[PDB]
Amino acid sequence: DPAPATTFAHLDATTVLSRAIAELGIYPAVDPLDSTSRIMDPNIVGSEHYDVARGVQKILQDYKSLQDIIAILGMDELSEEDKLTVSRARKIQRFLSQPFQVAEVFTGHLGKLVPLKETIKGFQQILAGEYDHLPEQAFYMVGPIEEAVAKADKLAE
Amino acid sequence: DPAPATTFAHLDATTVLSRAIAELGIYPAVDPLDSTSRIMDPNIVGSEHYDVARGVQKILQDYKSLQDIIAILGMDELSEEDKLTVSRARKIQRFLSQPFQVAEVFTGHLGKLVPLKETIKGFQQILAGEYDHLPEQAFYMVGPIEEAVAKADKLA
Amino acid sequence: DPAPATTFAHLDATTVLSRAIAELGIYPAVDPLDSTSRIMDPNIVGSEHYDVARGVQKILQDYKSLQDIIAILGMDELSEEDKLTVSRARKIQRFLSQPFQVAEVFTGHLGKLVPLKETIKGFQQILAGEYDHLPEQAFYMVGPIEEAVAKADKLA
Amino acid sequence: ATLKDITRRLKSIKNIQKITKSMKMVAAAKYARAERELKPARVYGVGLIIGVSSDRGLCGAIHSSVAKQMKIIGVGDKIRSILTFKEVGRRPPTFGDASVIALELSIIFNRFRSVISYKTLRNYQEYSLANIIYYSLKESTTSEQSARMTAMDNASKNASEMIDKLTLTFNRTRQAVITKELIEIISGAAAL
Amino acid sequence: KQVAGTMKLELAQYREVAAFAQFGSDLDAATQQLLSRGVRLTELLKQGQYSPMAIEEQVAVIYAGVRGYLDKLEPSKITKFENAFLSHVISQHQALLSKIRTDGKISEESDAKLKEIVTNFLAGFEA
Numbered sequence: 001d002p003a004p005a006t007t008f009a010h011l012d013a014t015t016v017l018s019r020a021i022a023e024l025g026i027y028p029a030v031d032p033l034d035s036t037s038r039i040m041d042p043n044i045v046g047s048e049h050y051d052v053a054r055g056v057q058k059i060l061q062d063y064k065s066l067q068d069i070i071a072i073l074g075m076d077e078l079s080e081e082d083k084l085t086v087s088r089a090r091k092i093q094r095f096l097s098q099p100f101q102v103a104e105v106f107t108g109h110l111g112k113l114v115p116l117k118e119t120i121k122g123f124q125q126i127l128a129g130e131y132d133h134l135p136e137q138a139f140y141m142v143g144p145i146e147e148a149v150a151k152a153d154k155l156a157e
Numbered sequence: 158d159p160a161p162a163t164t165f166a167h168l169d170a171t172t173v174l175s176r177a178i179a180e181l182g183i184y185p186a187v188d189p190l191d192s193t194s195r196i197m198d199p200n201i202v203g204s205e206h207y208d209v210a211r212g213v214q215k216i217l218q219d220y221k222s223l224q225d226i227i228a229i230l231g232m233d234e235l236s237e238e239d240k241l242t243v244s245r246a247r248k249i250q251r252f253l254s255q256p257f258q259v260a261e262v263f264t265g266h267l268g269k270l271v272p273l274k275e276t277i278k279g280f281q282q283i284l285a286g287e288y289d290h291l292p293e294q295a296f297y298m299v300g301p302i303e304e305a306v307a308k309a310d311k312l313a
Numbered sequence: 314d315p316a317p318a319t320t321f322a323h324l325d326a327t328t329v330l331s332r333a334i335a336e337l338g339i340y341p342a343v344d345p346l347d348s349t350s351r352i353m354d355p356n357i358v359g360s361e362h363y364d365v366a367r368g369v370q371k372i373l374q375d376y377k378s379l380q381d382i383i384a385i386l387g388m389d390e391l392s393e394e395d396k397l398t399v400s401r402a403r404k405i406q407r408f409l410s411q412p413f414q415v416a417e418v419f420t421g422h423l424g425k426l427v428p429l430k431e432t433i434k435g436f437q438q439i440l441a442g443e444y445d446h447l448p449e450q451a452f453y454m455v456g457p458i459e460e461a462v463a464k465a466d467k468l469a
Numbered sequence: 470a471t472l473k474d475i476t477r478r479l480k481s482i483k484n485i486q487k488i489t490k491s492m493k494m495v496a497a498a499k500y501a502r503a504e505r506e507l508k509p510a511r512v513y514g515v516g517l518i519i520g521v522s523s524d525r526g527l528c529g530a531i532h533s534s535v536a537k538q539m540k541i542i543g544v545g546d547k548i549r550s551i552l553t554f555k556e557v558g559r560r561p562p563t564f565g566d567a568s569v570i571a572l573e574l575s576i577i578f579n580r581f582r583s584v585i586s587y588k589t590l591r592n593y594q595e596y597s598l599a600n601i602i603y604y605s606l607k608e609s610t611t612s613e614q615s616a617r618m619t620a621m622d623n624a625s626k627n628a629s630e631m632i633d634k635l636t637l638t639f640n641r642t643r644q645a646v647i648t649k650e651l652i653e654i655i656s657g658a659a660a661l
Numbered sequence: 662k663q664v665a666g667t668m669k670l671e672l673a674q675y676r677e678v679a680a681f682a683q684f685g686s687d688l689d690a691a692t693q694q695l696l697s698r699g700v701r702l703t704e705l706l707k708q709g710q711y712s713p714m715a716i717e718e719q720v721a722v723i724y725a726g727v728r729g730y731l732d733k734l735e736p737s738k739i740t741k742f743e744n745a746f747l748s749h750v751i752s753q754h755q756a757l758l759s760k761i762r763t764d765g766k767i768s769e770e771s772d773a774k775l776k777e778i779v780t781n782f783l784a785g786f787e788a
Binding site: 386 | 494497498501640644
């Protein structure tokens with residue numbers, strides 16, 4: 001639409017929100033494959049932050065291109081490393097969600113704020129395979145990674 | 158389109174005919190999920206009439222949702238429970254067809270008029286699984302359910 | 314689109330140049346199945362021209378149907394009729410190529426302008442199986458059918 | 470409905486078409502080697518519920534066919550899941566496979582007819598048992614790979630038809646969108 | 662012109678088979694190779710920002726791919742291999758890069774040099 005389309009060029013960072021993502025209960029509803037920042041550069045944020053971010057974006061795009069394909073031809077046709085990107089991606093989709101302090105009246109959860117380094121560490125550990133054993137839902141709607149580990153325990157019984 | 162779109166609010170019963178359905182040989186080509194009535198209400202038509210109707214529409218809706226999968230992969234990739242809703246839905250879709258007196262030249266069948274209680278009975282019986290052993294084609298272009306049974310027998 | 318649709322009302326033919334065909338070394342890179350003509354009709358070009366063209370199209374179509382089976386079973390697992398259609402189709406594919414006069418500089422080979430009756434005759438004879446004994450490459454970049462015989466002789 | 474929808478539906482179905490086509494060709498290769506291997510196994514076939522299929526689906530009614538005859542041992546992981554031996558099907562079955570099964574211990578399997586069709590002393594008894602397990606296995610895989618080939622060929626051609634249809638729908642919508650937008654502009658302009 | 666032509670062709674062959682990569686368990690040796698070469702050439706077309714390359718550095722990188730030297734290298738390591746490989750040829754092999762530029766093409770000598778730089782460097786890289 002001309003109005004938002006003309007606006008993009010005026011920005012240094014863009015956070016693009018998606019109804020399709022909100023509809024899944026993933027809040028904030030940020031499209032991780034349509035959000036940009038002029039400072040997203042290894043020389044500015046450092047190579048660890050850059051690398052983790054691009055790795056997150058890569059696995060999510062890889063999953064995205066697999067979805068519609070495996071929604072018809074089935075999961076069991078996947079290689080034991082392809083289905084590992086699926087499980088990891090679906091965990092990463094959820095760890096991107098977060099309870100907002102301002103959103104308590106909507107979530108029933110207490111608001112969370114996550115320091116930059118903790119964010120990096122968390123998505124870095126998931127990508128490395130450190131939490132392949134934990135269930136998907138453990139990562140949904142929490143703050144730092146440790147909360148996903150604790151939630152997985154609550155869920156056990 | 159503005160003309161038909163605006164027309165819907167002036168009606169108590171809408172009968173919406175569909176080309177896709179006509180082209181499958183289903184006549185009258187009524188869309189059973191796009192046709193509605195302001196008196197489709199258990200307090201007016203009775204609970205039995207009301208429940209059969211909603212149950213027919215549910216299975217038709219459930220069938221419709223299964224059609225993208227069927228298109229690509231066909232029947233054999235469906236669960237046994239899904240094959241059953243498919244087979245029954247296809248029998249129902251056919252039992253909604255009817256030879257019109259006015260259309261005898263096009264159908265090659267004698268026109269039929271079915272009393273309400275028989276219509277309810279017929280669809281009630283299909284839904285209850287009473288004719289799961291019968292072939293689809295038996296239910297096409299007949300009147301009351303008994304004609305579907307006779308057609309299945311004549312097909313032998 | 315209105316633009317091609319409006320244009321197509323006027324066209325009596327299409328010449329389709331294809332990159333796939335060019336990468337097979339076939340020049341001119343004309344797609345033999347994709348190109349069409351409105352006057353490809355026995356009542357206009359004659360029954361003989363029509364039957365030979367239609368015979369070339371059929372064999373090329375048929376050869377396309379076997380290509381999956383070649384990639385799967387191998388060429389020594391084809392019936393003696395199917396072995397023969399691959400042999401002939403491939404020679405036909407090559408005899409459809411032709412050196413151009415306008416390219417005598419870049420290539421060094423003499424360009425060929427082939428009369429219609431010779432074109433018809435050449436392809437008539439390959440279909441009839443008159444050159445089953447000749448090697449496939451003899452039909453590549455040649456003019457009239459005699460030059461394919463002369464190229465077969467020159468290839469020792 | 471919308472151009473964006475159509476574009477995304479078209480993206481995946483074009484993928485599905487290529488995947489099912491490749492699968493058809495892999496299955497064609499397995500079936501070819503399976504049929505040539507079934508000849509010196511059928512004449513060898515001349516000399517409790519046991520169910521024989523495979524782990525792998527997308528081969529039409531291969532698994533559901535034998536499961537219908539079923540209602541206890543299952544060779545093929547799809548038998549245990551619908552209703553125990555795993556990793557059968559992916560590699561062609563050997564007499565070694567038949568012996569491994571008999572060592573652990575009516576037999577129901579699919580008899581190959583064509584690509585299109587299939588129909589569902591204490592040391593002598595040990596051999597004739599392994600002989601039966603083997604014969605079923607060799608028939609099983611010929612039928613399954615033929616069926617997967619046919620199923621995938623069918624799915625590929627279906628996708629292909631769906632692509633065409635969606636492409637026409639796409640272009641009808643595309644043209645409508647351009648015209649609608651243009652009429653809004655002209656109506657806005659002429660009203661001045 | 663030399664290496665780009667080879668790469669263009671092998672990337673096209675890859676593209677034909679590309680969708681059968683993540684769904685290819687029982688592919689024949691030939692199609693297995695087209696994928697292997699494709700993924701590696703694709704990785705070699707990746708490039709960092711703000712670091713444009715001399716044409717001879719470009720051809721030396723593409724050479725490693727089109728001549729099959731990286732076919733057994735895990736694809737995730739390619740960008741790392743290239744960066745280090747390029748650093749090395751720039752530092753220790755200016756003469757070689759010079760000759761690729763001057764000779765117009767890649768001679769029998771340049772070809773023999775690269776073969777030995779690449780294979781030895783690669784084994785060190787994977788050590």
